Design a protein around this ligand. Structure first.
Ligand SMILES: O=C1Cc2cc(Nc3ncnc(Cl)c3Cl)ccc2N1
Ligand SMILES: O=C1Cc2cc(Nc3ncnc(Cl)c3Cl)ccc2N1
Ligand SMILES: [Cl-]
Ligand SMILES: [Cl-]
Lengths: 4, 124, 124, 4
């Protein structure tokens, strides 16, 4: 999971 | 927004759509390319091709279970492009590049047409 | 093999599938969550959820145009998860995390359940 | 395009  | 994003989600969706195609699950169309038949999902074909997008948004053609392609279309070139639609991987070789580019032009798959053009230019 | 790969292909397919969902094109099922209804493509739901994969591979349920979820399922939690299926982006907030995790557990979306658990553990 |  990432900060887009 | 303040959303979080799962990096591998799109790739995992496409992998599962390809697994459904391989097991012939919920395929709703057969693409006829001369003597050869290819089963697929209308939604994936539309998501990958300008030609299929135009065909399946048409009020009469959206309901057809069989689509016949132009007789000049090579079945192997179509097969390679159908595999690319469902996997992101293109089996481009010296022996098939001309058929793959012509099929990608017909199917309106601009990124494929672009790499075929570059691979051909390099060989000249 | 000796294939070349188009990095953005899976993301571009998913973006187009979401555009078809927004315009209600070739959606073949309505998911009923208490008073709320959500239109979607059976193939995308199966590609994202263990529960939908089981439902639409069942010889009788594969033909249903309406699926009713358990009354304990929160419509907003479902909406957030449906948006994630079609975009890879999860709108996870303090006010919805419990409903999102419970819906992801029911839908069998293990990567979502995992991040909800980690976000909750950090707040404790 | 890349070599996967
Ligand atoms: O080279 C390409 C690949 C391609 C795909 C599509 N598909 C869609 N485009 C916009 N919204 C939607 Cl809903 C879809 Cl399905 C249209 C044109 C082209 N051209
Ligand atoms: O957490 C998850 C996400 C998910 C998706 C699916 N889907 C598929 N799996 C295998 N082949 C096929 Cl053909 C599909 Cl569609 C099944 C289980 C789970 N669990
Ligand atoms: Cl393309
Ligand atoms: Cl997930």
């Amino acid at each position: 999971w990432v900060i887009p | 927004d303040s959303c979080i994003q799962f990096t591998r989600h799109a790739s995992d969706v496409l992998l599962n759509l390809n697994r459904l195609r391989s097991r012939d699950i919920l395929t709703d169309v057969v693409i006829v390319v001369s003597r050869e038949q290819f089963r697929a999902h209308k939604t994936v074909l539309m998501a990958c091709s300008g030609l299929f997008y135009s065909i399946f948004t048409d009020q009469l053609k959206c309901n057809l279970s069989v689509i016949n392609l132009d007789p000049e279309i090579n079945p192997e070139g179509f097969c390679i492009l159908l595999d690319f639609m469902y996997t992101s991987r293109l089996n481009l070789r010296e022996g098939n590049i001309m058929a793959v580019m012509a099929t990608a032009m017909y199917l309106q798959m601009e990124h494929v047409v672009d790499t075929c053009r570059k691979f051909i230019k390099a060989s000249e």
